[PDB]
Amino acid sequence: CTLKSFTVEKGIYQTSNFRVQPTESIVRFPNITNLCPFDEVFNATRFAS
Amino acid sequence: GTGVLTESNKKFLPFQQFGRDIADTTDAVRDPQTLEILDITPCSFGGVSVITPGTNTSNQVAVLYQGVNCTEVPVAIQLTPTWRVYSTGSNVFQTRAGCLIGAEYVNNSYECDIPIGAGICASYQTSQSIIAYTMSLGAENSVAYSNNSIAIPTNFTISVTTEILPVSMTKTSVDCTMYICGD
Amino acid sequence: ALGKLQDVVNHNAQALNTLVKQLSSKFGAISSVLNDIFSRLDPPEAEVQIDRLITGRLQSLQTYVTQQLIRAAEIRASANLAATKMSECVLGQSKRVDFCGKGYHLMSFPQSAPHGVVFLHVTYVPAQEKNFTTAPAICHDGKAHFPREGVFVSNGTHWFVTQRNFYEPQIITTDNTFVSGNCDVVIGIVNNTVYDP
Amino acid sequence: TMSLGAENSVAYSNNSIAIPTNFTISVTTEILPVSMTKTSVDCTMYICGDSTECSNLLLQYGSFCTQLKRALTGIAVEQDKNTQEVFAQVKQIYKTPPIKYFGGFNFSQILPDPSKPSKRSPIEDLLFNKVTLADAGFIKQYGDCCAQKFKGLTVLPPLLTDEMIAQYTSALLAGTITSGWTFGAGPALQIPFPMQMAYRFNGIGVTQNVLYENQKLIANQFNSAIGKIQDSLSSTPSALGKLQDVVNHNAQALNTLVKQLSSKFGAISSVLNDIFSRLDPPEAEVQIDRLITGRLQSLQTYVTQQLIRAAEIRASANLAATKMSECVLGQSKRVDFCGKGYHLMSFPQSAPHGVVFLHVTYVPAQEKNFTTAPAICHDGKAHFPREGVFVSNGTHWFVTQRNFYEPQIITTDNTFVSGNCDVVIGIVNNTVYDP
Amino acid sequence: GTGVLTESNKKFLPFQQFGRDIADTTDAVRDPQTLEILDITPCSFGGVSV
Ligand SMILES: *[C@@H]1O[C@H](CO)[C@@H](O[C@@H]2O[C@H](CO)[C@@H](O)[C@H](O)[C@H]2NC(C)=O)[C@H](O)[C@H]1NC(C)=O
Ligand SMILES: *[C@@H]1O[C@H](CO)[C@@H](O[C@@H]2O[C@H](CO)[C@@H](O)[C@H](O)[C@H]2NC(C)=O)[C@H](O)[C@H]1NC(C)=O
Ligand SMILES: *[C@@H]1O[C@H](CO)[C@@H](O[C@@H]2O[C@H](CO)[C@@H](O)[C@H](O)[C@H]2NC(C)=O)[C@H](O)[C@H]1NC(C)=O
Ligand SMILES: *[C@@H]1O[C@H](CO)[C@@H](O[C@@H]2O[C@H](CO)[C@@H](O)[C@H](O)[C@H]2NC(C)=O)[C@H](O)[C@H]1NC(C)=O
Ligand SMILES: *[C@@H]1O[C@H](CO)[C@@H](O[C@@H]2O[C@H](CO)[C@@H](O)[C@H](O)[C@H]2NC(C)=O)[C@H](O)[C@H]1NC(C)=O
Ligand SMILES: *[C@@H]1O[C@H](CO)[C@@H](O[C@@H]2O[C@H](CO)[C@@H](O)[C@H](O)[C@H]2NC(C)=O)[C@H](O)[C@H]1NC(C)=O
Ligand SMILES: *[C@@H]1O[C@H](CO)[C@@H](O[C@@H]2O[C@H](CO)[C@@H](O)[C@H](O)[C@H]2NC(C)=O)[C@H](O)[C@H]1NC(C)=O
Ligand SMILES: *[C@@H]1O[C@H](CO)[C@@H](O[C@@H]2O[C@H](CO)[C@@H](O)[C@H](O)[C@H]2NC(C)=O)[C@H](O)[C@H]1NC(C)=O
Ligand SMILES: *[C@@H]1O[C@H](CO)[C@@H](O[C@@H]2O[C@H](CO)[C@@H](O)[C@H](O)[C@H]2NC(C)=O)[C@H](O)[C@H]1NC(C)=O
Ligand SMILES: *[C@@H]1O[C@H](CO)[C@@H](O[C@@H]2O[C@H](CO)[C@@H](O)[C@H](O)[C@H]2NC(C)=O)[C@H](O)[C@H]1NC(C)=O
Ligand SMILES: *[C@@H]1O[C@H](CO)[C@@H](O[C@@H]2O[C@H](CO)[C@@H](O)[C@H](O)[C@H]2NC(C)=O)[C@H](O)[C@H]1NC(C)=O
Ligand SMILES: *[C@@H]1O[C@H](CO)[C@@H](O)[C@H](O)[C@H]1NC(C)=O
Ligand SMILES: *[C@@H]1O[C@H](CO)[C@@H](O)[C@H](O)[C@H]1NC(C)=O
Ligand SMILES: *[C@@H]1O[C@H](CO)[C@@H](O)[C@H](O)[C@H]1NC(C)=O
Ligand SMILES: *[C@@H]1O[C@H](CO)[C@@H](O)[C@H](O)[C@H]1NC(C)=O
Ligand SMILES: *[C@@H]1O[C@H](CO)[C@@H](O)[C@H](O)[C@H]1NC(C)=O
């Protein structure tokens, strides 16, 4: 295929490359904790009119 | 990024988060969740080269995996997936040039036929299989030198040898306008 | 070895074929056909795609000339070597080792070949060597004698002087040797009789 | 302002001649690059780093990857050939005799040393250690690491390892010591070494009797001269710069290629994923196009530089190939081709990516003024010296070889007769002794 | 395009209408009106040297 010929002469030919594909994706946690306190405002006793 | 992740012996300053090599490619990263420094190495890759005696002298081929251990990337490994690389049963030889598959090694030394590299050459020899060997540097002869030993030829032969020298190449002209803008 | 001449032909044929194949390259444009772009893209924006093609063809042409220029230098170096070989080997006997054939060079015959030249080097190589015992000089009458153009040899009984390349022993005479110094200084001198004609 | 050299004048005068009294054997070193580093490039990896879209966009650009790969492959094959031509000039490997006594000389500095695990001469190691201070590859990181790489740039090992190359230099040295020039022309013929040097003395026009009379003096000069080579080589002044320049040039070119990756080439940024993420796919490809072309043009430029650089290396290799054939394998009449002065013999020494030649040359010294005449009139017939010069020490006339002052009485054997006495200019009354 | 239109002996299979050369340039065509095989050759040209 690379030589584009049906016959090949004796020798050494570079053809392609091989690469190991990734197996699984992954992502890491910034360990975020700055949660928004808007929830407890919704979770309040009294509410303005 | 993509690569094999492993723990690293590198030491990062607290504000340091990633590290780059000489070529300014990310070679180490600090994990966000855990303060551990993890080394990144690219997934194994390399060129593949095929040794053949010639289509008409058999069809068996020998595959060279350049610049990688046979261990890391054996017949188990995809790219050229239909290539099973035969099997581990097929002779696997480790050379400085790279992994070699489909050829065996012998202690007998012949003249080089197909230059693998790093002092290794392959050929088709007897039953008929691709065989890899170390180059025979030449026949070994020791000449007897002494204080008073002289060798003088008694008889001669006339030899005719041929030398081939290129002299001229094809003269070519290009009509640029037609080539770049044809009709 | 005619492949050396053949490789010159193939490289030019291969390079030209590579240039031809480059035309089909789109070079990031819509298509590789100049006419189709113009009918498909109006002049206000067609030149954007044409320029991509023009640059692509121009780059391919530029590389081809550069490759030819580099290759031409290699041929010229070969041509100069051939010219020197024709002058030094064909037109005269060359003392340079291995410049004309292998071994001592006698003559060279030029033969024309397509896009090259073939040299038939007539060389003299020795054979059938025979060991001998030698001595740097011969002491005859208290005076050291040195071979004028040969080397002293003996088969074991009688010493002889002969030419270096061919074995032709001769009786050591005052004509074959020139006398210098005395016998003590020379290391390895050997007693023998020097015949006087 | 540069001073070209020390101003010198020579007292040219008719009938005035200067002849050396004796000589000085000098060993000069000459270094020639032979082969450069064999390199290959992964076309896709360099242009696109783990980007499928760039990989797709790379396909329609053309068959440049095939073209670039072929160009570098031709260079790599040529490099192995260059090494083969320089060193593989001996059909048969020769072994040094077990006894190392050669008429009073060493060759121990240049002969391979069995003590070292690497079968290299002491001089070879000094060349190796000095050059390898700035070297590349080493193990080549065959095991996991680095030496560039991971960008597509790889280094291919040479066909011939250093050890086998050293064997060739060892084989050449053994043949030259034991056989002189004979093994180059044909079958190797042994010849006692003092006789071999005597032959080479005749080649440069010095009668062999001179060598045998001063064998001890010559041997000491030769041994001492070799010793100075090690000190001069091990000295900080680096004559190995030519070999170093090849290493630097390849490293400089490769470093430029890596640097070119960071270039934006007119795009907004040099990060492929940044282009795709920040820009919409319609506009993103425009920047990708510029980056691909810019990276390509960088790759094309590097190939052209390598191809040009491959020329003189082959030219240097071709010159080295002739020098090994013309100087090592025989005496060379060509002036200054093999060292400075009258060439006697040359010893090849392998070096990283090159070869070092040790030219042994004959240098005259301690000249003396003399009075000379073109011919001698004795019996009404002019006498001409057959080889020597006609010199008068002041009151008598002698004939001596041109290079060495070895006066002799004028005899009919030393001089051939031709013509009368009046025609020639500068003839001188004298008597020609007849034995 | 511009060229010389001639009858062509190359046989096109019934589905085939276009023919291409080594350079991947259209070398033959089937006429839309009447199904016939026509090859296209560029008009005569040549370098001029004085
Ligand atoms: C945020 O990071 C901390 C440490 O930086 C994590 O704590 C881990 O688990 C316990 C409880 O804090 C510690 O004793 C361990 O030493 C921590 N492990 C490591 C590897 O550091 C904490 O779990 C992280 N936040 C979340 C939500 O997981
Ligand atoms: C001349 O005679 C000597 C003495 O035997 C030869 O030296 C040995 O020759 C044989 C075969 O010829 C070798 O196998 C030995 O190795 C030689 N001896 C040593 C110490 O090497 C010498 O070879 C003879 N000359 C020729 C041309 O054969
Ligand atoms: C010199 O060498 C030549 C060639 O190596 C040989 O001559 C041959 O001698 C044999 C026996 O006399 C003949 O049958 C051959 O025909 C000769 N060769 C040729 C080419 O004619 C022999 O070794 C030596 N000859 C002499 C005369 O010394
Ligand atoms: C060494 O060479 C000489 C020269 O041929 C040999 O001496 C001659 O040998 C032949 C054959 O026996 C006799 O016919 C001659 O009379 C010899 N010449 C003299 C002057 O005696 C000698 O024999 C050779 N050495 C050996 C050991 O054969
Ligand atoms: C060669 O012969 C000479 C002379 O016969 C030897 O030199 C010395 O000569 C004197 C008088 O002629 C003798 O009294 C000595 O006995 C000789 N020396 C020796 C060691 O006997 C010379 O030695 C001889 N050399 C060889 C190698 O035979
Ligand atoms: C030898 O050399 C000397 C000086 O180098 C020559 O002396 C002069 O030569 C020129 C050249 O013809 C004459 O014109 C002068 O007249 C010479 N000087 C005197 C004082 O006469 C001398 O001529 C040379 N010998 C010969 C034979 O020409
Ligand atoms: C030849 O030239 C050499 C130059 O080295 C002279 O050799 C020196 O000779 C003196 C006295 O004999 C010794 O002390 C030195 O050691 C010698 N030099 C070396 C390097 O060993 C020699 O004198 C010259 N010969 C003539 C006849 O002038
Ligand atoms: C040449 O002959 C000498 C004998 O003179 C030997 O070489 C060495 O010579 C020195 C001094 O003469 C002796 O001390 C050594 O013992 C000799 N070497 C050996 C191994 O005995 C030797 O016979 C010859 N040289 C060779 C064959 O290279
Ligand atoms: C041959 O040269 C060698 C190497 O210089 C000599 O051997 C050395 O001699 C020196 C004398 O100062 C000493 O350092 C050692 O004995 C040897 N080795 C080294 C590494 O220097 C030797 O003397 C010379 N002559 C011979 C061997 O006959
Ligand atoms: C030029 O001629 C000869 C050279 O051999 C010298 O003459 C000899 O001188 C020595 C002492 O100086 C005498 O013992 C010899 O008897 C002399 N021989 C002859 C033949 O004259 C002469 O001295 C040389 N000239 C100079 C200036 O040295
Ligand atoms: C060389 O010797 C010859 C022989 O004597 C000299 O020729 C003589 O020269 C004188 C004066 O010129 C004449 O009177 C004689 O008649 C000459 N005789 C002969 C036989 O020719 C010649 O002059 C000498 N050359 C030199 C340079 O002195
Ligand atoms: C190579 O194969 C071809 C086709 O099978 C054949 O014609 C040719 O003779 C073969 N070459 C040799 C050297 O046997
Ligand atoms: C041949 O070489 C291999 C390793 O290269 C070695 O293990 C073996 O002992 C050698 N000899 C034979 C007969 O296999
Ligand atoms: C192959 O990998 C092993 C570790 O798995 C390593 O020890 C060895 O050196 C590697 N091969 C080479 C030729 O370095
Ligand atoms: C020869 O004589 C000239 C003139 O006196 C002088 O300059 C020169 O040095 C002398 N040559 C030698 C070798 O002394
Ligand atoms: C109309 O087109 C068809 C298809 O090519 C053709 O066969 C037919 O002859 C055409 N009509 C005329 C009047 O030529």
Tab-separated table of N, CA and C and ligand atoms in Angstrom, chain C residues 154-160 167 169, ligand 4:
chain	number	residue	atom	x	y	z
C	154	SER	N	67.476	-14.740	0.749
C	154	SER	CA	68.164	-16.015	0.636
C	154	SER	C	67.129	-17.114	0.778
C	155	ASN	N	67.329	-18.263	0.132
C	155	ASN	CA	66.362	-19.300	0.453
C	155	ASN	C	66.777	-20.080	1.690
C	156	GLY	N	67.943	-19.792	2.248
C	156	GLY	CA	68.475	-20.608	3.316
C	156	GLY	C	69.952	-20.897	3.152
C	157	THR	N	70.425	-20.957	1.910
C	157	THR	CA	71.832	-21.219	1.640
C	157	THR	C	72.544	-20.031	1.014
C	158	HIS	N	72.062	-19.539	-0.121
C	158	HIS	CA	72.733	-18.482	-0.865
C	158	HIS	C	71.860	-17.241	-0.893
C	159	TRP	N	72.463	-16.098	-0.595
C	159	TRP	CA	71.730	-14.847	-0.584
C	159	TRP	C	71.544	-14.322	-2.000
C	160	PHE	N	70.490	-13.535	-2.186
C	160	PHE	CA	70.175	-12.980	-3.491
C	160	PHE	C	69.531	-11.618	-3.309
C	167	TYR	N	59.426	-11.858	-7.994
C	167	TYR	CA	60.538	-12.673	-7.522
C	167	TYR	C	61.442	-12.998	-8.701
C	169	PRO	N	65.519	-13.658	-8.482
C	169	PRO	CA	66.780	-13.568	-7.743
C	169	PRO	C	67.966	-13.358	-8.668
F	4	LIG	C1	69.142	-21.339	-2.882
F	4	LIG	O1	69.309	-20.845	-4.229
F	4	LIG	C2	70.482	-21.301	-4.928
F	4	LIG	C3	70.396	-20.739	-6.325
F	4	LIG	O2	69.701	-21.624	-7.192
F	4	LIG	C4	70.589	-22.827	-4.927
F	4	LIG	O3	71.893	-23.185	-5.371
F	4	LIG	C5	71.890	-23.959	-6.593
F	4	LIG	O4	71.096	-25.146	-6.502
F	4	LIG	C6	71.072	-25.911	-7.718
F	4	LIG	C7	70.169	-27.096	-7.468
F	4	LIG	O5	70.790	-28.042	-6.609
F	4	LIG	C8	72.487	-26.323	-8.134
F	4	LIG	O6	72.416	-26.912	-9.428
F	4	LIG	C9	73.417	-25.118	-8.177
F	4	LIG	O7	74.760	-25.541	-8.390
F	4	LIG	C10	73.334	-24.337	-6.875
F	4	LIG	N1	74.190	-23.164	-6.924
F	4	LIG	C11	75.323	-23.065	-6.221
F	4	LIG	C12	76.092	-21.791	-6.388
F	4	LIG	O8	75.706	-23.965	-5.479
F	4	LIG	C13	70.402	-23.395	-3.528
F	4	LIG	O9	70.351	-24.813	-3.594
F	4	LIG	C14	69.120	-22.872	-2.906
F	4	LIG	N2	68.933	-23.442	-1.583
F	4	LIG	C15	68.370	-24.641	-1.385
F	4	LIG	C16	68.251	-25.086	0.042
F	4	LIG	O10	67.971	-25.332	-2.313
